[PDB]
Design a protein around this ligand. Structure first.
Ligand SMILES: O=C(Cn1nnc2ccccc21)N(Cc1ccsc1)c1ccc(-c2c[nH]cn2)cc1
Ligand SMILES: O=C(Cn1nnc2ccccc21)N(Cc1ccsc1)c1ccc(-c2c[nH]cn2)cc1
Lengths: 306, 306
C-alpha cells in the first residue's frame, strides 16, 4: 500500500555523468560509448548568451578547447560537432559503464526521473512531469545544465531530457538528446516566458484509479457523463479536454477497478464543482496530475483492495 | 529555483541488493563485504508469523537452508546468525561493489531515501520522513521486505532502515541495520497499530525558510512569539512542541534569511490560525513537514532571492 512520487533507480545514469569545461564555463555531460553530450551553451561566456551565433562561436574552437573529466580521469576529445542545441564530443575512451540505452522524445503529460548533477557529480533524483506548456517544475541551481531526465524499462535507459535553462518563473526548459528544445524556447537571452499551462486530465483520472486500487471509493458517485459534458466542466477549471484516445488509455485501470471511465469522469466533475470537503485522496488535499496511467500500473498492486 | 522531494542517487545501494530464499519464502537482502543482511522473517512460513519462536525456527536451519542470488550469481552461505530482528548470512564472496558505509539509527523527524526492491531487483527510489510515531508513509507491495533506507554524505552510505512490515493503516515499519525496530513494533501477528502521530514542527519551519530563500515572503508578519505562547497554539493543531534545541538548529537558515526563528514561529502561528487563504508556499496548499533543516540547506541556493 501507499503511493509516492517514485523515481527510477539512478545507478545506470550515474555511471554516465561527466564534467565538460570550455574556458571558464563548466557544466555536466552524458558519456555513452565514445560520445559526450552536453548543452552547446558550454562554448559561451555569460555575455555571449545575449546574442550568440553558435556556428561562429564553435568554428573558433579545437578538440583541445574542451576538457572532459570522468571522476578523476581526463578524457581526451578527438572530435566535436553541433547537433541542434547539443554539442557531441568524441572521446578516445568508450564508457565501460554505458547501459543499454535509447534516445526518446517524450510527449507532454509524460513523466521521467531527473538526476540533478553539478560538476559531473550526481546530487539527487526526483520525478518530473513534462507540463503541457513544455516546462518542468524541477529543482535546479547554477551548474545543473547537462543534468538528464530518463525512464528505465527492463535495464534499457530511455534518455528523454537534457537541462538547459531556468525561465523567469523558476520553471525549467531543455532538450531531447538530439538537442531539440521541448517547447518554443531558445538558448539565448530573449523575453521568452513559460506559456499558459493546464492540468493533465488523463493523469488526474489515473491517480483517482490508483486511489480505488489502494481501497478508497469516497469520491465516486451514481452519475455518468458524456465526453462533451465533461469537457464543458474541464474548460471552466483549466483542465485539458478529455479525448476518446485518453478514455481508451484508461481501459486497463477501468477493468482492474470495475469503474467505467465516464463514471470516473463524473466523479472528477463532482470533485471540480464541490471540492474535496476537507477530505484527502492518497493523502493529498488536491487533485494530483503528475502520475500517468503507466506510473499507476507500475506502482500499484495488480489486486484491487475491494 | 524549485523545491522537490529529492532522494539521494541510488547507484551505491543498487550494487548491494540481492535475493534471499529460505524454502518457499523470498525477500531482499543487503550484501556488504562478505555479509548479507535480511529480515529474520525469511525463515518463517506465512503461518509461522502467527506466533514464531525465531530461536527455535533458526536452530532447525543449516547454511544450505539459505539461497542468496546476486544478479545471476549464486552466493554460497558459509555461516548464519540472528541479530535482533535481522539474519546475518556469511557468504564465500566479498561484494566488489561495497561502498564506504556506516549503520546509523535515525531519529524521529529525520528523512532518508528508500530503494524499493523486489526479488533483489531495485524498482524505485523516493524520500521518506521517519514519523514521530516511528512509521514511514512508504509505497511497498508484497516482496518488498529487506528494501533499505539510506542517506549519502561524501560517497559514504549511511544505512538507516530495513523494511519488515505494513501495518493495518497502510503505513510501514522496520528496523535499523542492527535489527532493532523503530517504534514498539514486533515481527509477529498482534493487534499492533500505528500510534497517534504529530506534525514535525521543526521541518515545517525549515520549509518556510526554504520558501523565503526561494524568494517568497507573503506569509511573514510583524509579530513575534515566545516559545511557550507558540506551544499553546502547537498543542491545539497537533504540532510537536518547539524546543530551544529546535530554535538553535534553525540558526543557519535564520541567518541566511535575516528572519529570527521566533518571528518565523509567529508566521506559522498565523498560518495555523488563519489558514493559507487560497495561497501556496513552494507550490503547496498545505504546510510540508517532510524536509529537515539539513534537507533545505542541501537543496536550496546559499544566496537568498531578496
Ligand atoms: O537559465 C540558465 C542556466 N540555468 N539553468 N538552470 C538554472 C537554474 C538556476 C540558475 C541558472 C540556471 N541561463 C539563463 C539563460 C540566458 C540566455 S538563455 C538562458 C544561463 C545562464 C548563464 C549561462 C552561461 C553560459 N556561459 C556561462 N554562463 C548559460 C545559461
Ligand atoms: O506486512 C507484512 C509484510 N509486508 N511488508 N510490507 C508489505 C506491503 C504489502 C504487503 C505485505 C507487506 N507482513 C505482515 C505481518 C504478520 C506478522 S508481522 C507482519 C508479512 C506477511 C507475510 C510474511 C511471510 C513470512 N513468510 C512468508 N510470508 C511476513 C510478513
Amino acid at each position: 500500500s501507499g503511493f509516492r512520487k517514485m523515481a527510477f533507480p539512478s545507478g545506470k545514469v550515474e555511471g554516465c555523468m561527466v564534467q565538460v569545461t570550455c574556458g571558464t564555463t563548466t557544466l555536466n555531460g552524458l558519456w555513452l560509448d565514445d560520445t559526450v553530450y552536453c548543452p552547446r551553451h558550454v562554448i559561451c561566456t555569460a555575455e555571449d548568451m545575449l546574442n550568440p551565433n553558435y556556428e561562429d562561436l564553435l568554428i573558433r574552437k579545437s578538440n583541445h578547447s574542451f576538457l572532459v573529466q570522468a571522476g578523476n580521469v581526463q578524457l581526451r576529445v578527438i572530435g566535436h560537432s553541433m547537433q541542434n542545441c547539443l554539442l557531441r564530443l568524441k572521446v578516445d575512451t568508450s564508457n565501460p559503464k554505458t547501459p543499454k540505452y535509447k534516445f526518446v522524445r517524450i510527449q507532454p503529460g509524460q513523466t521521467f526521473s531527473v538526476l540533478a548533477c553539478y560538476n559531473g557529480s550526481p546530487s539527487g533524483v526526483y520525478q518530473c512531469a513534462m507540463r503541457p506548456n513544455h516546462t518542468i517544475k524541477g529543482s535546479f541551481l547554477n551548474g545543473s545544465c547537462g543534468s538528464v531526465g530518463f525512464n528505465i524499462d527492463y535495464d534499457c535507459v530511455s534518455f528523454c531530457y537534457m537541462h538547459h535553462m531556468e525561465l523567469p518563473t523558476g520553471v525549467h526548459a531543455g532538450t531531447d538528446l538530439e538537442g531539440k528544445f521541448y517547447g518554443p524556447f531558445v538558448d539565448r537571452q530573449t523575453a521568452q516566458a513559460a506559456g499558459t499551462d493546464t492540468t493533465i486530465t488523463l493523469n488526474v483520472l489515473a491517480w483517482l484509479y490508483a486511489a480505488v486500487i489502494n481501497g478508497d471509493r469516497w469520491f465516486l458517485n451514481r452519475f455518468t457523463t458524456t465526453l462533451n459534458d465533461f469537457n464543458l466542466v474541464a474548460m471552466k477549471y483549466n483542465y485539458e479536454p478529455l479525448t476518446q484516445d485518453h478514455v481508451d488509455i484508461l481501459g486497463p485501470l477501468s477493468a482492474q477497478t470495475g469503474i467505467a471511465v465516464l463514471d470516473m469522469c463524473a466523479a472528477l466533475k463532482e470533485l471540480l464543482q464541490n471540492g474535496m470537503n476537507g477530505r484527502t485522496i492518497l493523502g493529498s488535499t488536491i487533485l494530483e496530475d503528475e502520475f500517468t496511467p503507466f506510473d499507476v500500473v507500475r506502482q500499484c498492486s495488480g489486486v484491487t483492495f475491494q
